[PDB]
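fyi for ur records
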Amino acid sequence: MSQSNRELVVDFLSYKLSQKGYSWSQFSDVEENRTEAPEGTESEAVKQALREAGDEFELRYRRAFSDLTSQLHITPGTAYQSFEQVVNELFRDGVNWGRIVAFFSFGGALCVESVDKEMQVLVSRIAAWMATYLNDHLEPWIQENGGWDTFVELYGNNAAAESRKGQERLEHHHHHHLEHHHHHH
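which gave:
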């Protein structure tokens, strides 16, 4: 519902941090501040959606990602107001699904550099900033267009499955098939 939206942030930031060699449980106060995550029913899909999305956005707009992350350059004691002034431009740009992608991909970068800059309190609050923006500002647009299920499909099973036969069409069967050629490549 809403607590699952915090998962899409936290576990995603941890997904980037773990890649960088950092552990989320090491920087965030676990026992000192138990923030429980539910069973990822919807989260299982959307977190995969953003996982696949972060791939497409990165491979297609890696340069843009570089400029925007430098604009989101996390500083000592970053107020959420500054964070919002950036992420506002995601919505103000005519927020497409890629803005959500970008938003989640930004945190994935922010959380990392926050640790390198020895701001282990900021990496954790980054998740909070994202959860806030997602819950308050982003959710209205998301649900308006159908919800996460709409976005997930775009990088999910059926949408891609329908284009799977397109790969077979890409073959353009013009090669003389007389026997069974072992492997095409």
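Residues 97 and 151 are 7 Å apart (CA to CA). thats all i got for now
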